[PDB]
Design an enzyme around this catalytic site. Structure first.
Site, mmCIF file in Angstrom:
data_model
loop_
_atom_site.group_PDB
_atom_site.id
_atom_site.type_symbol
_atom_site.label_atom_id
_atom_site.label_comp_id
_atom_site.label_asym_id
_atom_site.label_seq_id
_atom_site.Cartn_x
_atom_site.Cartn_y
_atom_site.Cartn_z
ATOM 1 N N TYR A 17 71.187 62.443 38.069
ATOM 2 C CA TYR A 17 71.011 62.461 36.624
ATOM 3 C C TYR A 17 72.332 62.233 35.898
ATOM 4 O O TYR A 17 72.342 61.886 34.723
ATOM 5 C CB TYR A 17 70.383 63.788 36.191
ATOM 6 C CG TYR A 17 69.018 64.020 36.800
ATOM 7 C CD1 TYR A 17 67.870 63.564 36.167
ATOM 8 C CD2 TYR A 17 68.880 64.683 38.014
ATOM 9 C CE1 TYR A 17 66.623 63.755 36.729
ATOM 10 C CE2 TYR A 17 67.635 64.879 38.580
ATOM 11 C CZ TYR A 17 66.511 64.415 37.933
ATOM 12 O OH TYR A 17 65.269 64.604 38.498
ATOM 13 N N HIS A 22 71.203 59.653 30.132
ATOM 14 C CA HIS A 22 71.165 60.972 29.500
ATOM 15 C C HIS A 22 72.543 61.616 29.447
ATOM 16 O O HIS A 22 72.669 62.798 29.140
ATOM 17 C CB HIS A 22 70.202 61.895 30.252
ATOM 18 C CG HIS A 22 68.813 61.865 29.711
ATOM 19 N ND1 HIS A 22 68.044 62.995 29.542
ATOM 20 C CD2 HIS A 22 68.064 60.833 29.274
ATOM 21 C CE1 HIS A 22 66.881 62.653 29.018
ATOM 22 N NE2 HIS A 22 66.866 61.344 28.840
ATOM 23 N N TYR A 68 72.087 71.287 32.004
ATOM 24 C CA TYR A 68 70.927 70.448 31.735
ATOM 25 C C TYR A 68 70.450 70.642 30.300
ATOM 26 O O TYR A 68 70.784 71.640 29.659
ATOM 27 C CB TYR A 68 69.796 70.750 32.720
ATOM 28 C CG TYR A 68 69.981 70.098 34.072
ATOM 29 C CD1 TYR A 68 70.871 70.614 35.006
ATOM 30 C CD2 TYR A 68 69.262 68.960 34.413
ATOM 31 C CE1 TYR A 68 71.036 70.014 36.239
ATOM 32 C CE2 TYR A 68 69.421 68.356 35.644
ATOM 33 C CZ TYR A 68 70.311 68.884 36.553
ATOM 34 O OH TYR A 68 70.469 68.286 37.782
ATOM 35 N N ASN A 70 67.790 71.566 29.209
ATOM 36 C CA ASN A 70 67.043 72.817 29.113
ATOM 37 C C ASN A 70 67.935 73.934 28.578
ATOM 38 O O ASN A 70 67.492 74.795 27.819
ATOM 39 C CB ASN A 70 66.515 73.220 30.495
ATOM 40 C CG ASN A 70 65.650 72.150 31.136
ATOM 41 O OD1 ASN A 70 66.163 71.209 31.744
ATOM 42 N ND2 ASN A 70 64.339 72.304 31.042
ATOM 43 N N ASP A 95 69.777 60.072 23.453
ATOM 44 C CA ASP A 95 68.968 58.887 23.708
ATOM 45 C C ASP A 95 67.515 59.137 23.325
ATOM 46 O O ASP A 95 66.996 60.226 23.545
ATOM 47 C CB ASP A 95 69.044 58.535 25.194
ATOM 48 C CG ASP A 95 68.529 59.659 26.082
ATOM 49 O OD1 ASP A 95 69.185 60.729 26.141
ATOM 50 O OD2 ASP A 95 67.471 59.480 26.722
ATOM 51 N N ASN A 116 62.143 68.182 25.420
ATOM 52 C CA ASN A 116 62.819 69.404 25.854
ATOM 53 C C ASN A 116 64.202 69.543 25.217
ATOM 54 O O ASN A 116 64.555 70.614 24.725
ATOM 55 C CB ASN A 116 62.929 69.450 27.380
ATOM 56 C CG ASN A 116 63.758 70.625 27.865
ATOM 57 O OD1 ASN A 116 64.958 70.500 28.092
ATOM 58 N ND2 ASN A 116 63.129 71.782 28.017
#
Length: 191
Positions: A17, A22, A68, A70, A95, A116
């Site tokens: 990731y 992101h 993250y 989250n 994004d 999220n």
């Protein structure tokens, strides 16, 4: 006068990731901070990545969550209190599927692609009001929600307008403090 505004860069450091779209926040901020004469400080807690740089004239605090999305909402809250800055008028680079890759839209709201990453912060603050900068990455074609596709992408087409976003982002962010949001969002809509 001249209080340091909070600039939040959305990054998603992960195994695969950290190589995605992101990671805008720390990937873009790296090159612009390096040029103005700014080094990043690692304050592992609420300030995992923070740089204080002054564009246009006023020094602002660019913070990047190294966690993250989250956990992103959990970073801004405590951090804002330390510098006594209101998390209302904050700018967050992120994004979104709102538009295709090439041009960007800075808008206040949260319900399109990265639900999220919008929800985490919005629900933590208990309100919206955040005027975030949405980098158009396009809408991943499929019968499933882009949520699944945006976690791992390798489309050469996204690379074509990367330099375009760089010039726009670096200019708009400085002009934002220089004059206002209108001149900035007009330029990114003009080029």
């Amino acid at each position: 006068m001249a209080e340091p505004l909070l600039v939040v860069g959305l990054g998603n450091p992960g195994p695969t990731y950290a190589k995605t779209r992101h990671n805008l926040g720390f990937m873009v901020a790296d090159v612009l901070a390096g040029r103005i004469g700014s080094a990043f400080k690692v304050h592992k807690k609420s300030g995992a990545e923070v740089v204080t740089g002054r564009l246009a004239g006023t020094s602002v605090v660019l913070a990047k969550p190294r966690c993250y999305m989250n956990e992103s909402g959990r970073q801004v809250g405590p951090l804002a209190k330390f510098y006594s800055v209101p998390p209302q008028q904050i700018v967050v680079i992120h994004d979104e599927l709102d538009i295709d890759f090439g041009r960007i839209r800075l808008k206040l709201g949260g319900g399109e692609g990265g639900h999220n990453g919008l929800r985490s912060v919005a629900s933590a603050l208990g309100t919206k009001n955040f005027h975030r900068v949405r980098i158009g990455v396009g809408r991943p074609p499929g019968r499933k929600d882009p949520a699944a596709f945006v976690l791992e992408n390798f489309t050469a087409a996204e690379r074509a307008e990367v330099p375009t976003i760089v010039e726009q982002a670096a200019d708009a962010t400085e002009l934002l403090i220089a004059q206002g949001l209108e001149p900035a969002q007009n330029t990114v809509h003009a080029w």
